[PDB]
Amino acid sequence: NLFQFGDMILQKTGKEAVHSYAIYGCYCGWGGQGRAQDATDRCCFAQDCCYGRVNDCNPKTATYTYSFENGDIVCGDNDLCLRAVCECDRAAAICLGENVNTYDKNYEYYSISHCTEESEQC
Amino acid sequence: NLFQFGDMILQKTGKEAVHSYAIYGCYCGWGGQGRAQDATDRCCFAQDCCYGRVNDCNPKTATYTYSFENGDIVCGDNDLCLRAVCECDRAAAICLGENVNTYDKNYEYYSISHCTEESEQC
Question: Is Secreted among the key words of this record (chains A, B)?
Answer without folding.
Answer: yes
